[PDB]
Amino acid sequence: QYIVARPVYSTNAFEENHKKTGRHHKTFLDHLKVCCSCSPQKAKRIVLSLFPIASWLPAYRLKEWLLSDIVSGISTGIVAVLQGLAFALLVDIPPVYGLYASFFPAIIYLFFGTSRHISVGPFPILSMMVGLAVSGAVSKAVPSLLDDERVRVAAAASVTVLSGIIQLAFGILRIGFVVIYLSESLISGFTTAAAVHVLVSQLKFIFQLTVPSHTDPVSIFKVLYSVFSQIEKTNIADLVTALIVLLVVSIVKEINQRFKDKLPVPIPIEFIMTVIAAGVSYGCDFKNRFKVAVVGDMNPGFQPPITPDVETFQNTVGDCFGIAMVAFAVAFSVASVYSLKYDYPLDGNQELIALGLGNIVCGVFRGFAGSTALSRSAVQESTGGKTQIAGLIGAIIVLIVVLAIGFLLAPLQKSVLAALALGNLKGMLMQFAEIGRLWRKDKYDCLIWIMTFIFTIVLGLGLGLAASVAFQLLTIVFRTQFPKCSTLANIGRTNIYKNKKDYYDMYEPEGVKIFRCPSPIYFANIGFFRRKLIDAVGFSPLRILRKRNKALRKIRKLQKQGLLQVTPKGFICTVDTIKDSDEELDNNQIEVLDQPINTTDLPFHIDWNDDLPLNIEVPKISLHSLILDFSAVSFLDVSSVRGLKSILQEFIRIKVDVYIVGTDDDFIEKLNRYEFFDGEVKSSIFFLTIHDAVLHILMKKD
Amino acid sequence: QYIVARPVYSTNAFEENHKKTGRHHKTFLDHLKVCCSCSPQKAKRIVLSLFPIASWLPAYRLKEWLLSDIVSGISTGIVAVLQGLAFALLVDIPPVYGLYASFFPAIIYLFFGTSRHISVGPFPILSMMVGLAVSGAVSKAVPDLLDDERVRVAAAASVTVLSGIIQLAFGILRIGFVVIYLSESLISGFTTAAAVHVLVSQLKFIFQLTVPSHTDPVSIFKVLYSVFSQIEKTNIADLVTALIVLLVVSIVKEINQRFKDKLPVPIPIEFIMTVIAAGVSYGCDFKNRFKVAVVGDMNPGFQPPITPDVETFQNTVGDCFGIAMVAFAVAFSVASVYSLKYDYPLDGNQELIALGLGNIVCGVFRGFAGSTALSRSAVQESTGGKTQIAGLIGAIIVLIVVLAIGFLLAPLQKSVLAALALGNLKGMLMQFAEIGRLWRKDKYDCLIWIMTFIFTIVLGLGLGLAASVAFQLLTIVFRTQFPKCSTLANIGRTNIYKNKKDYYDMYEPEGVKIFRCPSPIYFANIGFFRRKLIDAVGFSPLRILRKRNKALRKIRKLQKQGLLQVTPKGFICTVDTIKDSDEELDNNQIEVLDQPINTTDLPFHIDWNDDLPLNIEVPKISLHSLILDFSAVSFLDVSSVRGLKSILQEFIRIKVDVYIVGTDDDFIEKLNRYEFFDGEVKSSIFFLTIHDAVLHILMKKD
């Protein structure tokens, strides 16, 4: 049974009886000393962290990893070639830049990356964010089809170079923990909005229509209007072939997911349908019989590096910041699943550095933004990916496609790629069945999800992330704005104290009120806390103090006039009744009422609760003690400290004690720094538990 | 002493023994029913709240309030005329609009306002924010010195009409509680930055220099450069007269503040120095002897109303929102001091409605934004202001100045007003002695103050408020990002549990770890909480489960091969030593390790902690129970719930119990909605206090 027999402590007798260890908190001088303390072991650790390949490559097991890595690399290389060709169209650049952006960051990540399963390249969200950034940049540059494509390519290279520089700077600064400011609900809402954006954007390629590059403020609706204002000019053959490809891919993906145990090395539907479509377009000549747009004959080989444009750097700072943040968050979210699945450590700063270097190299070599895509990562993992050697094999396949087999993929329909991209939208769009779950569960994360979706949809991907982050930060204040403050009472004559309106046989101590605030008190909570405390107490301590001071001043004036003769016990009051001549105070003297009462000159100790001569109101209070249950109060910063000090001073000045209960050692240590304690609000008002506070009150009363 | 003898409770036996009251929580259907339930008493209350004059005017005491109100009204009318003339120059409009904006909102507030001491009009922060909004609006108008000010006046009228409409909408929506999202540190920083802005902006009038209206991004530095690039063209007479006026005003204000008891009806230094300067300028002709700019001959009378410009409405939406928010916050902050001083209720929604209506009327009648100024409010309160009759008398004085005495104030130097405005900068600039105090106290509110100052200075008043609000919201996440998680232990063989690294004679139960998170756990805290819990425990439950599952699979394979014969007690193990032929698991099958172990088919109960045959590692764990001290955990939303569920499942699946301790009834009630409880994580794992949890563990063990 719960049996305890201990003395009553007040967080000061406790410390006096039990000696503390006197731990030395770390200062700032020694923080820099240990950082600059260079040692060979720490240097080797830093070098190995910066070059994870030097650690994971010599530990390769070339007996059970080589074949699986090779197969997974071939599969992911085919998928990466197809996905780069598809996503190069979203930026509205020649397709070969998609291959470049699928090749270069993977090669850089093979050296500088810490994850072992993700595949680096383009994914639709980042691709369209880069495209929007390019459209914004080329619309602000100070003043043919070939020239427009070249300027778009240059703008994309500059934007992705700046994004890689930002990512590398973030990784160097060791601030790679910024991924925790994005809630799971915010991630879900943003991903669903981006999925809708992808579905809207791929329509102009499915229908084979010319759509101008729109601007960030309202992009999806403008694109939809532009697409549906020319719906008559659609290509029926292109539309039907896109539908067939999408239907076949979705059906095969469904059967592949359903039949997993019986199906090793899952069917490469992307490759199979792509080669089928290319063979159908060839021979049958799906470029003159119909007017289907096809992927042009890409130049076999790479391209010389270019210097990024400082004008674009200046123009698209915010867009590049958003691109870097989105890429890092997506990469971390994708890599964390496989890291937890296969039990290896993940380094956020190393991931940021690798992504930044890869993006920088890709932009220097005329590419665009690169990260890991969920579809490609899942393909690589399911095929049997064990290390980044699969990524190297995929890069080799991409290089082979770029160099040798370049005449192929030319009869490609330039919209089978769009249908393949839309085939990856099923998992993204299935997240729409989350509003109901969040509404049933939280009712606040549902608000976060809805607001994030609306903000992204009506503001573009670049600004929706910032707006959603701001609203998600505000939702914490929403949570801790109106805490369910309640009065506590004893249950069963034990040390159990719960809500006053919950149980039946409870009992409160005579003239004792226990108040609990089940939320941290900060700038947005001090006023509500004070109002709730005053309402629970039942009177205003400031009002009581002011009325008592007015009564004392009237009594002193009467004594000066001689109507009141002071005696050791009682007042003579040699007047039956006065005409009740009240006195008013001017504007600059009303402060004196708030001053504490000191009746040392009067030998009689005024009770302020029984009766006053000459019929003075002086409202009485039956509350002779107050206990604050600061057990759930995590922190106070400035305004809460000032409000608490004012409330405690007002309470103490009317001859009632205040006790703070439930705070640990750290809370009182922090409060000591705020100059909270003084000659009035001593440090002995803190008690361990409500029962100790109540027992101390009872002991001091009788 | 502290003597307790009660049975051990687990928040379920407690509820079974003590019957709850079964309170009926209010739903949403009845929330609308009580709002639409119209009653005569509620209608009368609503009408009286909407028209507070009908409540406070009949209760007038015309024996002790009339004379003081008249004197305070005369003084505040003189001060309001001077301050309106001064602040009309900051917007760069003819001075008479300052008188209009000092007259109209005061008249509207006399009817629709709830405060009794504040004086409505212009104040420099709002005046310059309106000026910046006007400069932005006139710089974006589509193209079609006397005509240059007309468009500025029209833009100011439109901007203030929109701001008043926004304020009225906010008051109608009953969202007048938005003043609690601005911390005291944020308010102090913004006020100091605005003071610096005022000091910089008034330089062009002190030196009598022509400065173009700059734009929001970097305004103060551009104005400073423009002023100091033409410092040679300054007027020495204007500078010296401004210096004398400022010095005399500051000295007289200092002596007035110091000598308060001996000095009733504080000296009207503004009025006396203004009339002295006007008489000197008129007598000595300070318009041709020197080149001092003077206030022009304002047209005696009012001006017809104008329709606000929809183009300006569309152009300056954000600026109008900022103006409305700043005006409401300033008015509430100024009025709260006097409301607390004189003990009368304040209505935020009524204040918002009154301010919105006043601003709407003033903008319609060609004025600019109106609120209460601290200087004017202090003058009115000190002079003897009791009700808004002082405001009415001030409006009457302003009307008299507008109509009858208009030929005066013409020889005014147009910079003595600037020096008078500078004289009010002492109180604002005294707030610079707060960085040190906040650094010594909080180290977070100091960051808020510094960031607010920097953001406002380098982004303008309109955008600095939003940036500082965002950073202040982020500071809460900064506070609750890395909580000081610690292990707890018993002290003195009682029910007191504190930090493990704090005391000497502590003792932990055998194989029991107590973990405490002294902060609410949300999206930005779940990962850190999991990492700290794993580090405190000393092992990874997922790793232990995976290794145990691998060992079980190897044992089952050996049993199938016949090397292991299952017996009721022990394994025969008819092999001296095997060649240690480990088996690797490919992808799409590694998840089976995470599945829970169910050794029902084996009669032997595997201990998983003593030893295993054929030398299998199976790392042992000494921990056999875990207690989470969720006493300071205020709330979980989605991600924290999911992470807690995953951690608890991982712990339970390795045959260890988890106990959550310290949560109240509301926390478990909220957690029940998240579908947290299921067949594995039951609802009986919640306990009242750490001592109950420990006693239950000891009872279960033996």
Ligand SMILES: CC(C)CCC[C@@H](C)[C@H]1CC[C@H]2[C@@H]3CC=C4C[C@@H](OC(=O)CCC(=O)O)CC[C@]4(C)[C@H]3CC[C@]12C
């Ligand atoms: C509170 C939540 C819902 C977010 C607030 C919504 C606003 C940020 C949105 C809603 C309506 C939007 C506007 C709707 C229409 C237009 C007209 C549009 O002008 C054009 O026709 C541009 C044509 C072109 O240049 O291609 C430019 C964007 C704009 C101002 C939009 C800007 C963004 C606005 C103000």
Ligand SMILES: CC(C)CCC[C@@H](C)[C@H]1CC[C@H]2[C@@H]3CC=C4C[C@@H](OC(=O)CCC(=O)O)CC[C@]4(C)[C@H]3CC[C@]12C
């Ligand atoms: C995330 C935390 C840790 C740091 C965030 C810092 C950024 C918000 C600041 C720091 C430096 C700033 C940049 C400093 C200098 C400039 C140059 C400036 O261009 C000009 O000089 C104007 C030229 C012209 O208008 O002709 C445009 C803004 C920019 C990129 C600034 C954008 C905002 C930046 C990136």
Ligand SMILES: CC(C)CCC[C@@H](C)[C@H]1CC[C@H]2[C@@H]3CC=C4C[C@@H](OC(=O)CCC(=O)O)CC[C@]4(C)[C@H]3CC[C@]12C
């Ligand atoms: C419990 C789990 C397995 C989910 C069960 C429900 C889903 C199968 C349903 C519920 C809501 C459905 C969504 C409701 C609305 C839409 C929008 C719509 O997509 C669009 O094309 C919208 C964009 C546009 O074309 O303008 C059609 C599919 C989708 C995502 C639906 C896909 C199927 C969802 C996710």
Ligand SMILES: CC(C)CCC[C@@H](C)[C@H]1CC[C@H]2[C@@H]3CC=C4C[C@@H](OC(=O)CCC(=O)O)CC[C@]4(C)[C@H]3CC[C@]12C
């Ligand atoms: C992280 C903290 C420090 C706040 C972030 C700082 C930025 C928001 C500031 C710092 C430097 C500023 C820039 C400094 C210089 C200029 C050049 C200026 O161009 C002119 O010369 C305008 C001349 C005119 O039109 O009158 C336009 C604003 C701009 C880009 C400023 C925009 C706002 C910036 C980027």
Ligand SMILES: CC(C)CCC[C@@H](C)[C@H]1CC[C@H]2[C@@H]3CC=C4C[C@@H](OC(=O)CCC(=O)O)CC[C@]4(C)[C@H]3CC[C@]12C
């Ligand atoms: C603070 C919460 C409670 C509400 C916030 C809502 C605002 C952010 C939204 C709602 C209405 C919106 C306005 C609705 C209509 C217009 C007109 C529209 O502009 C045009 O039509 C431009 C035409 C052109 O460019 O020729 C887009 C901006 C604006 C001012 C919108 C700006 C954003 C506003 C103010």
Ligand SMILES: CC(C)CCC[C@@H](C)[C@H]1CC[C@H]2[C@@H]3CC=C4C[C@@H](OC(=O)CCC(=O)O)CC[C@]4(C)[C@H]3CC[C@]12C
């Ligand atoms: C209550 C006690 C502890 C006050 C302590 C005194 C100082 C901490 C304060 C009081 C007056 C302050 C000064 C008042 C006025 C100004 C002018 C101000 O001018 C500007 O902004 C730059 C000049 C320009 O704008 O041309 C700069 C800050 C400064 C020196 C202030 C710096 C901080 C000071 C010295």
Ligand SMILES: CC(C)CCC[C@@H](C)[C@H]1CC[C@H]2[C@@H]3CC=C4C[C@@H](O)CC[C@]4(C)[C@H]3CC[C@]12C
């Ligand atoms: C290139 C331009 C001129 C093409 C025409 C653009 C028109 C069709 C676009 C631009 C802005 C768009 C609006 C922007 C925002 C919203 C709010 C949303 O909740 C419903 C759709 C609605 C109301 C959009 C309707 C379509 C719209 C009016």
Ligand SMILES: CC(C)CCC[C@@H](C)[C@H]1CC[C@H]2[C@@H]3CC=C4C[C@@H](O)CC[C@]4(C)[C@H]3CC[C@]12C
């Ligand atoms: C006209 C020219 C001079 C305008 C200025 C362009 C150059 C100097 C600016 C534009 C964008 C800037 C970058 C924007 C963002 C960051 C991230 C930060 O963590 C480090 C600095 C860094 C990487 C900046 C470096 C300087 C930068 C590249």
Ligand SMILES: CC(C)CCC[C@@H](C)[C@H]1CC[C@H]2[C@@H]3CC=C4C[C@@H](O)CC[C@]4(C)[C@H]3CC[C@]12C
């Ligand atoms: C003549 C008018 C039109 C334009 C004047 C432009 C020049 C003088 C202005 C515009 C932008 C200004 C800069 C904006 C921001 C900063 C950062 C701050 O920490 C120091 C001052 C500094 C570096 C300013 C110096 C002056 C500046 C360069």
Ligand SMILES: CC(C)CCC[C@@H](C)[C@H]1CC[C@H]2[C@@H]3CC=C4C[C@@H](O)CC[C@]4(C)[C@H]3CC[C@]12C
């Ligand atoms: C040229 C045309 C398109 C411009 C249209 C301008 C008008 C219709 C718009 C522009 C800005 C709008 C205001 C912006 C903000 C709010 C605050 C909200 O709480 C009530 C409505 C209100 C006050 C809006 C009313 C309508 C408004 C005045």
